[PDB]
Structure formats: C-alpha cells, structure tokens
Symmetry: D2
Subunit: 248 residues, 4 copies
C-alpha cells in the first residue's frame, strides 16, 4: 500500500508544490485548504487523473478558537477515512501580515497568526500522534531571528513553531515519529507585493540573486520524509540561498 500525507494550505504556491512532489514520490495526499476551494479541487483532479483515488480535499479554518482542536482532529481523520493511514504531516498553512506594535481586532490577529503558524500545527501534531516511516515537517522561517519590521505576531508564531518542532521531535521519538522543519528565506513572494519590492529582496540573496521556487522548498521536505533522513529529527533545514547570513 502507498503511504499517505496531509499537507495543510495545499491549494497554492509552496503547499501545492509539496503536495504534488509528495504525490510524484508515491504518496496519496489530503489537500487541505481554507478559502481556495477551486484551486484545491483543481489539484485533486490533476493528481487523481494521474493515479485514481490518490487525492482528496479537506476544508478547515486553522484560526485559533474553541473548535480548532476538533477541526484539526478532523483533518487527520479525513486522511484515515480516505486512505486508511496517515504517514506524513506537513504543516504549511500560514496567515501572514503586519501587526504593528504602535480592520481586524488584535484578538483576531492573534487568533489567525498564532493559530495558523503554531496552535494548529500543535493540535495537528497531537492528532497525528494519537491516531497511530512516520514524520512531520513544519514550514519555518530562515528569517525568524532577523524578522521583518512590525511582524511580531507572525514572528511569534514562527518562533513557536521552532519550539514545537523541537519539543515534538523529542516527545514523539519513542513513537518513531520524526519531527523536522524546512525554513524558506525568500521563496515565492506575496502575490500582492509590487515587483520593485520583490526585486529588493531578490538582490539580497547571495546564491543567484533570486527567490527559491516552490519546488526547491518541496525538495527539502521530500528529503526529510524519505529514508535518507531516518536519523534526522528536530532539525530545521534552511533553504534560503544564504539570506539569513547577510548582515544589515
């Protein structure tokens, strides 16, 4: 039987590329999405056309609330319903926007940013573990220690994610569950961001003066879930072209 993976926020960009590449390796995948139903289903179609009954979608808001544990339990449950197993969890979905210290309410901002980048991954990890080459891969940030100005809540989520990656690695190791991280520097830049500001980030990158493709990020995930990484756990691999190494 083929192994099965959950990728959260898998409709677009890096999430999609992870899901595709996992599928190409031989995984059956649950494409999680929140608002991008059209794109999520489109990908399920494309993947099922390649091999039948190997892709399903699952809708859930990963914002922190009273229903979030239940929601995360249901994401893991859908992988078991569809595929009879869950071998891999990739924590990709992430809310990302400025929260300056000085029209959402701040408690919504907290809920979305800490919820998506930290709490959901935590609850998903709990369920993944409860329900059992098993491994979890969290998408981190090579820039966590050199954050962007006014992104404190996001940066807190990403720092919390580092903490979870290490803590889960440690606690789940007796279960043969490896927990690791992939940390993009600048990859696909926000679709909204103007081309000029995209270029300013690109010039910063030592290796090639460009962003990572989503496939290059996916490559590291693929390595981390493979048998070439059986001893690797609690490791966060920067895939950043040397960006985090550049001084101000």
């Amino acid at each position: 039987e083929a192994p099965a993976a959950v990728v959260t926020g898998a409709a677009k960009r890096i999430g999609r590329a992870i899901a595709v590449k996992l599928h190409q390796t031989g995984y059956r995948v649950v494409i999680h999405y929140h608002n991008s139903a059209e794109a999520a289903v489109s990908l399920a179609d494309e993947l099922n056309k390649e091999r039948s009954n190997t892709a399903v979608v699952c809708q859930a808001d990963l914002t922190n609330s009273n229903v979030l544990p239940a929601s995360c339990e249901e994401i893991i449950n859908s992988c078991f319903r569809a595929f009879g197993r869950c071998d891999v969890l990739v924590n990709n979905a992430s809310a990302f926007y400025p929260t300056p210290l000085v029209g959402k309410t701040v408690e919504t901002q907290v809920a979305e940013l800490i919820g998506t980048n930290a709490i959901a991954p935590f609850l998903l990890t709990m369920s993944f573990a409860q329900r059992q080459n098993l491994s979890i891969v969290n998408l981190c940030d090579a820039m966590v220690d050199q954050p962007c100005m006014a992104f404190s809540l996001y940066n807190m989520g990403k720092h919390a994610l580092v903490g979870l990656t290490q803590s889960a690695a440690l606690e789940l190791a007796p279960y043969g569950i490896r927990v690791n991280g992939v940390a993009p520097g600048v990859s696909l830049l926000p679709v909204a961001m103007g081309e000029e500001e995209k270029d300013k980030w690109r010039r910063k990158v030592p290796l090639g003066r460009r962003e990572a493709s989503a496939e290059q990020i996916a490559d590291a995930v693929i390595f981390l879930v493979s048998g070439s990484a059986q001893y690797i756990t609690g490791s966060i691999i920067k895939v950043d072209g040397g960006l985090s190494l550049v001084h101000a």
Copy 2:
C-alpha cells in the same frame, strides 16, 4: 521624580524579588498578581512602609481571551494612574505545566500557557509603547528553550514565542528609545509542589555550584538590563543558568 515599573506575577518567588530589587534601586512599582492577593498586598505594605506611596497592586488574569487586550491596557494604565509614568515593564507572570501530545480542555491549556508566556507580554508591550529617561522592557525567558523538558510543548512554545517578541519588539521599538531584553533562568526556585529528590536531580546537573539560582540572582540581571550600564543593550537575552544549558544529555 522616581521612575515606575510594572512587574507581572510579582506576589511571590522571582517576580517578588524583581519588584523588591527594582524598589531598592529607587523604582515605584506596580505589583501585578492573579490569585495571590494576600501575598501581593503584603509586599505592597512592606514596600510602602519603606517609602510611602511607592507600591500598588493590580489584579488581572493573563489567560488569552478577547478581553486580554483590555486587561493588559489596564495594567499599564494602573501604573500611569498611580505614578504618572511607566518606565519599565517586566514580563514575569507565567503558567507552567505539562501538556503531553499523547482536567483542563486543550483550548484552556493553550489559552493559559500561550496567553501568559507570549500574548499577554505582547499586548502589554503594545500598551507600554503606545502610552509613551531610560525606557526598557525585560521578558523572563528560558535558558532551556532549546532543550525543553519532556511533554512541555505548549509552555515551550510560549517561551519560544517570547524569544521572538523580545527580538521583534527590540527592533520595532528602538526608534522610540525603548530597549527590549530578556533574562533566561535555567533552574531557579523550583516549583513548590516538586519533591525534594526531583529538585536535587536538577541541582546536580548545574555546573556552577550544583544549586539553583536564588530569585535575587535572577533579579540582579533584570536590574542590570534596566540600568544605565545597559543603554546600548537591546534584543539581548542573558542566560542566568550556572551553565546548565551547556550540559549535554
């Protein structure tokens, strides 16, 4: 006029020692507390007996909820009402218990642990900043963030989040002359509930003296960070751990 400091969870242990020592340096202090009303008021009395009208208590639950921003705003507002200013904020209050991955609900656990160690400090930072000398924030971190004790995922996440905030706030508030730093105890005063044999096992682990830090030794670093001897220091986290974090398994 004397400067003024907010210390969260200041009724006992490390919080109390920070509040006392700040007071001894010449700060007027707001003793924040949650359940320890008796001990918080006791400390206010002791400090006011030393110098009149220099200590006040403030009650607030720092659990995450939609009203926590309002609560945190009111803590900072309490310092301005009492003392007419707020020069220092020490983020000390912290929920601490295991949350294994494998009778509180998890939603409560998340709220208490992430709320106390990260979200409250974030909101308190927001208010401190907006309400504005030598201004500085000091967050109590964990020298063991990267070698967490088993099954303390939620706590460890808060503390990691605290590291992120310490650095992010440092960076954002530096144009306001507000320094943001951290003090990172290894093992200090161990939980009152913890058995003595368990306490000893941690003590033996410590390279420098095979003992825990006194609350005073933790406070000392805070005092340094708020002083003029640290005017250029920001986004720094000082381990006060006796070398614990350096010891391999």
Copy 3:
C-alpha cells in the same frame, strides 16, 4: 563526464561511507588519508573494481604548519590531475581527543585539533575555489558544538570555527555558484577505543531509537547536500543526531 569529489580522511568510518556513497551516486573520488594507507588503498581497489579509473588515494597530514597551505593545495590538485575537475569537497578528516584546561605539547595539540577541524578545511576551501555544474562543499560539524564534552576545548573550538567557515564561505563563494553546507552528527560511530559501556551510555541518551547513526545515515545527508535537490541550500548545517542535541542534562 562524471563529476569528481575529494573526501578527506576517507579510509575508514564516516569518511569511507561518504566516499562510497558519492561513488555509488556516480562521482569519481579522491580518497584522502593520513595514517591509514592500507585501508585507503583497499577502498580505492574496491571502488575501481566496480568502475575502472574512478578512485585515487592522496596522502597528507592536515596538522597546522607553514606547509599546510601547500599540502591542501596538493590535495585539490590531485583531484584535477586524476579526474580533470573537482566538483565536490567533503571536509571530514578530524583529530579528536581531550585537551584539559587544568604526552603531546599544547603546541602540537593546537596544531592537530585546530588544523584538522578548521584550518585545513579553510585552506582546502581556498584551493577548491581558486581552481574553478553543481559545485558544493560539505563540512562535517558537530550537533553537540553548544553542549560540548568536558575537557574538549580545542576540539570544540575547531568545530565552532568550522561553523564559522561554513557560513563565511557560503556567503563569499555564492557568487561563484559554490554552495557551502554542513552535516552535524550527534553520536555516530563511536571511537574504536571507547569501552562498550560508555558507548551504551551515549546510546541511551538518543531519543530516536536509542542508537548511534550508521556512517551511511551521515553520508545520506551529504549526498542530499551535494545533489540537485539542494541547489538553493547554502550555509545550512543539517543535524543528523536522532534528537540528541535537544536533550537537557
């Protein structure tokens, strides 16, 4: 044409497994050795028997001295003479013994330990770069660099220096398309000398499987780093440690 790799200290253990696995991927390899001529030549035979003219040995002492630059230049030159190119450098060779602060001279201890773990890698990096497709350097680091063994100061300094080189070379050589990365074993193949009970004490420490990494598992990460699956990776150090570095004292 097949690409070519230099692996230093490749006669035994982790170095041999790296060299073997690079060869199995399709690299022609220079087996560097110091003392282990018999084993180095044995591996060259084994590899050449598999594919003819794809393995050569290269003898050099990597101890620091005024002739080490020349020696390191000659190792890189040996790969160009044999194979007409040099696509990959793996910095594996490493002296490893205690140097307590409190019968070699300390001069020799410095030279061996800092020489092998830092200065040779630096000089080899220099020559690799100067003599110039998917070009990359891989340095064997230490997942325990921040929780060192007792009395291993000189070794630990070399390994910390190696971290510095990994990052600095990454940064400087990136305009040349040369990626510099690291693989950091926790406990892998333990010293042949070490008693079995001491070996077991380390093994029990490991969260993932309570065992050491095989040399093959270390090699696997090197293979990943040199591959096209890591084209955007540089200045990254991948722990291959079974969670060891995460375990508190």
Copy 4:
C-alpha cells in the same frame, strides 16, 4: 587587598576602556599591548597617578607559534609578580582584516587571526586556571552569524572564541571560575575606515543609529566580573543596539 585583572590589547579603544573601568571599580590591572608601547605606558601612568602601584604594562605578540604558550604563561605570570594574584582575565586583543578566499602569506594570516582571537585566549585561559570572584571575559562578535564578506579567518577565530567561552565555562565551573562573553555589534570603528563607511554601519543600528562607545562595551564586562553575575557563566551578552537582529 584589591583584586587584579589582565586585559589583553589594553593600550587603545575598547581594551583601554575596559582596563580603566576595571581600575575605577578597584582592580589593579596589567595592561597588555603588542605595538602600542607609548599608549600602554601612558595609561599605566594615568592609572598609577590615580592610585600608586596599581598598573603595569606587559608586552607580548599573541600570533600563533610554538612560543605562544610560553608567552601566554608569562602574561599571567606578570600579573602574579606585580599583584600577587590574578582574579580576572579579559580576552580583548584581536587582529582584524579581510582574508578573501579568492602581502602576508596565508600561514601568517591564519597565525595572526586565529592566534589572537582564539588560541591566545585558549592558552591564557589554561594559565589563568592552572595558577589558581574569579571570572574570564572574552570579547566576541554579535555579528558572528552574519559575518562581513571575505572575513573568513577572523570569523573563524570569533566562532572559535564562542566555543572556548562555553567549553571553559563548563570545565572551569568546578573551580569557581566563570567564563562569559561580551559581543559588540558595531563599536569604535577602525581608525582607517572612512567616515561615510562608518555612517553606513551607524544607520544600520536600530537603537540610536550610532556605534557603542568603548565605555558601553566596558559596562557589560564590569557587570560580568561583578557579584551581580555570580551565577552567570557561559553567557554571551550582545551589546549591539539591535544590529544582529536587522535583516539584509
């Protein structure tokens, strides 16, 4: 009787400020120097004029060689001869220049840079320890993980220094010897550096858009050698105005 400190490279800049401030706290000091004899003795006079027989100079090259252990032993020995004790060692002296990967020989470059920033501190630590509120303070670099371009050998020394700080801390703690570090971002800039380059670095600094004075660096050293840091060991305090936190 008053405690005694060795400060290496104490004739100018940060070294001088450390030595002065230690003296002001009540230490007798050994001003080590290499080329700056005039400035070193000038400071000895200034300090002895303040309190008699409290300052001595000490000439030594800290370049790596087969005589360096002997030289380092003699620096520590001079403090014992002068003052009958040695309570504090401050590892400040440091060679600093580019060593690009692509007219000194490279073996000299290695010897100066690794010798000054790492090996001398190592040997001085050895002697300090063997000869016995005792503590060692090493001058590190807040930018060690975001190095300047082409400063590989320097950066290696500084990283080696981090290793030594932590390893000595751990090994010397049973002797009551605390080992810690002070990590300047941008402090006093090289005298040679032009003013506009100096400004480019200054603008990078979040806290005040200026470099640290030598005194601000010295303040942290003073804290680390004091009774207010009795439990602190293997800690490296950044004194960098937030510089290391700024992304490219």
